[PDB]
Design a protein around this motif. Structure first.
Motif, PDB file in Angstrom:
ATOM      1  N   UNK A 195       1.001  -1.189   0.042  1.00 53.78           N
ATOM      2  CA  UNK A 195      -0.112   0.191   0.060  1.00 53.78           C
ATOM      3  C   UNK A 195       0.595   1.046   0.353  1.00 53.78           C
ATOM      4  N   UNK A 196       1.362   1.491   1.017  1.00 54.63           N
ATOM      5  CA  UNK A 196       2.743   2.817   0.879  1.00 54.63           C
ATOM      6  C   UNK A 196       2.199   3.969   0.718  1.00 54.63           C
ATOM      7  N   UNK A 197       0.388   4.010   0.700  1.00 54.58           N
ATOM      8  CA  UNK A 197      -0.285   5.345   0.351  1.00 54.58           C
ATOM      9  C   UNK A 197      -0.394   6.292   1.780  1.00 54.58           C
ATOM     10  N   UNK A 198      -0.039   5.631   2.777  1.00 55.94           N
ATOM     11  CA  UNK A 198       0.208   6.481   3.828  1.00 55.94           C
ATOM     12  C   UNK A 198       1.209   6.703   5.289  1.00 55.94           C
ATOM     13  N   UNK A 199       0.777   7.917   6.250  1.00 55.44           N
ATOM     14  CA  UNK A 199       1.796   8.456   7.072  1.00 55.44           C
ATOM     15  C   UNK A 199       1.760   7.073   8.168  1.00 55.44           C
ATOM     16  N   UNK A 200       3.000   6.869   8.774  1.00 52.52           N
ATOM     17  CA  UNK A 200       2.770   6.225   9.730  1.00 52.52           C
ATOM     18  C   UNK A 200       2.125   6.247  10.563  1.00 52.52           C
ATOM     19  N   UNK A 201       1.955   7.330  11.320  1.00 50.19           N
ATOM     20  CA  UNK A 201       0.409   7.309  12.364  1.00 50.19           C
ATOM     21  C   UNK A 201      -0.573   7.261  11.792  1.00 50.19           C
ATOM     22  N   UNK A 202      -1.086   7.220  10.636  1.00 51.22           N
ATOM     23  CA  UNK A 202      -2.316   6.921  10.300  1.00 51.22           C
ATOM     24  C   UNK A 202      -2.291   4.751   9.738  1.00 51.22           C
ATOM     25  N   UNK A 203      -0.648   4.431   9.486  1.00 53.14           N
ATOM     26  CA  UNK A 203      -0.717   3.174  10.084  1.00 53.14           C
ATOM     27  C   UNK A 203      -0.822   2.241  10.985  1.00 53.14           C
ATOM     28  N   UNK A 204      -0.568   2.672  12.554  1.00 54.68           N
ATOM     29  CA  UNK A 204      -0.989   1.858  13.314  1.00 54.68           C
ATOM     30  C   UNK A 204      -2.086   2.579  13.867  1.00 54.68           C
ATOM     31  N   UNK A 205      -2.581   3.871  12.769  1.00 53.52           N
ATOM     32  CA  UNK A 205      -4.825   3.604  12.959  1.00 53.52           C
ATOM     33  C   UNK A 205      -5.006   2.955  12.118  1.00 53.52           C
TER      34      UNK A 205
END
Ligand SMILES: Cc1cnccc1CN1C[C@@H](c2cc(F)c(F)c(F)c2)CC1=O
Length: 472
Positions: free
Chosen positions: A58-68
């Motif tokens: 995916x790699x379409x989001x920020x690290x914070x978005x990954x955790x959420x």
């Protein structure tokens, strides 16, 4: 006092009827049918825990978005567990299981084609909501067809399908995601998501053939439907065993007796009934049992999910001192190591009892968690994780059996859904805390998990014995 007496009489007569029907072809067919839904839940868990937080595709989001991305799905699983567990005590096990599986399948299918992070998050959240209701409904549904002779072993054999789903999801991930050549806006993670939805569709298809639980009919005034279901069970079992000439002798069974505005009032009444069922779990007859159940479920879930996110990071630390394929292989080994524990727990559940199983498994899990602090290399950490999972799954099996047997049929799925929602909340909290303890130290996570497991064992020692008793 009258209602308790009538329900005890109903339980005794239901046990006698189940003894007359026997155990055989019908029970094993239903076992496989519900194992399909448990496999779907296992596949969902694997996807959410490993590939869902945008590992590489995916790699379409920020690290914070990954955790959420994962924690919101766990919260949705909590919400769905509570909702479907509450609704199963009023609408029926089969009906709510079908609805939840349909929601999960539809939104898992939708998430494969979406072309945006927000829509993908929404679809995966609703898929988690749909799938959260599987375990509480499935275990009660299967338990309401089992006699007391080997009920614990039969319930424990049902847990194999969660591991089977984990293995299926791991193999499909290993096969699909690295093969980026399958892209055609479309990529390989979409193919993997699409393939992961097949077990839920198969579960729906198989479940369409099975009948509703006759215990639910008896608890809700529908005598004739329950009689027909019981006669079907008896006829199937006797025909399978070579005695079709035997006649079902049961005659009568004890029985517990604009459009949108009507929809609204019906929904309000249903919600009120569900809330009453939930509040009745904290009454004087069940308050102490419920509080002890809450502690055992929470501590076990908090420790397991806390360690399973701490473990890969510790391996990464070791690899620094010393590829997605390694992730797939490690997840596959971790879910595969569960099998001996499942087999031994199934064979010993009725022989040694639920309480001894839970206590011994909790003690062994605490000892293995403490042993995790001695890890020195990747291979030793992998072996210790396999050992921990294999020795800990038996406590989960015993807790499933106890939760099934500790509550009456009219509140069983409500209590199970509440406890499963508490488990999902504990998973969220453990993941968050042990991720907040990523590199600060090493002793503290191990000590916290060991203390939680010791508290869980101490609370488990105080539970009552339900073995050798009719299903209330
Ligand atoms: C079957 C079940 C019953 N009730 C609630 C939840 C579940 C599903 N499980 C199994 C649990 C588990 C325990 C282990 F020790 C392991 F090693 C492992 F891989 C997994 C965690 C989970 O999500």
């Amino acid at each position: 006092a009258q209602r308790r007496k009538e329900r005890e009489e109903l339980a005794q007569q239901y046990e006698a009827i189940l003894r007359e029907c026997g155990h055989g072809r019908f029970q094993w067919t239903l076992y496989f049918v519900l194992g399909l839904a448990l496999m779907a839940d296992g596949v969902e868990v694997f996807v959410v825990g490993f590939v869902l937080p945008s590992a590489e595709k995916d790699m379409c989001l920020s690290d914070s978005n990954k955790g959420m991305l994962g924690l919101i799905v766990y919260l949705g699983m909590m919400v769905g567990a509570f909702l479907w567990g509450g609704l199963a005590d009023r609408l029926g096990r089969r009906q709510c299981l079908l609805i939840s599986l349909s929601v999960n399948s539809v939104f898992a299918f939708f998430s494969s084609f979406v072309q945006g992070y927000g829509t993908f998050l929404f679809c995966r959240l609703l898929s988690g909501v749909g799938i959260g209701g599987s375990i509480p409904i499935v275990f009660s549904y299967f338990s309401e067809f089992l006699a007391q002779e080997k009920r614990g072993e039969h319930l424990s054999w049902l847990c194999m399908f969660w591991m089977i789903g984990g293995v299926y999801a791991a193999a499909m991930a290993w096969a699909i995601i690295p093969h980026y050549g399958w892209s055609f806006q479309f990529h390989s993670w979409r193919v993997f998501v699409l393939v992961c939805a097949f077990p839920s569709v198969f579960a729906i298809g198989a479940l369409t053939t099975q009948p509703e639980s006759p215990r639910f009919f008896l608890e809700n005034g529908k005598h004739d439907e329950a009689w027909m279901v019981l006669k079907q069970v008896h006829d199937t079992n006797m025909r399978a065993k070579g005695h079709p000439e035997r006649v079902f002798s049961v005659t009568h069974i004890k029985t517990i007796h604009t459009w949108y505005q009507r929809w609204g009032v019906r929904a309000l009444s249903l919600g009120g009934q569900v809330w009453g069922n939930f509040l009745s779990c904290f009454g004087p007859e069940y308050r102490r049992i419920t509080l002890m159940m809450m502690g055992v479920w929470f501590t076990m879930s908090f420790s397991y999910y806390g360690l399973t996110v701490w473990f890969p990071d510790m391996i990464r630390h070791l690899q620094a001192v010393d590829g997605a394929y390694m992730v797939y292989f490690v997840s596959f080994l971790g879910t595969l190591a569960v099998l001996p524990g499942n087999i031994v727990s199934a064979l010993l559940m009725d022989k040694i009892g639920r309480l001894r199983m839970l206590a011994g498994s909790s003690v062994m899990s605490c000892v293995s968690c403490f042993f995790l602090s001695f890890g020195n290399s990747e291979s030793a950490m992998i072996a210790l994780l396999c050992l921990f999972g294999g020795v800990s799954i038996a406590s989960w099996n015993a807790l499933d059996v106890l939760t099934v047997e500790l509550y009456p049929s009219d509140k069983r799925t409500t209590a199970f859904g509440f406890l499963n929602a508490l488990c999902k909340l504990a998973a969220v909290l453990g993941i968050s805390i042990f991720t907040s303890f990523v590199g600060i130290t090493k002793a503290a996570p191990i000590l916290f998990a060991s203390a939680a497991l010791a508290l869980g064992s101490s609370l488990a020692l105080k539970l009552p014995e339900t073995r050798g008793q009719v299903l209330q």
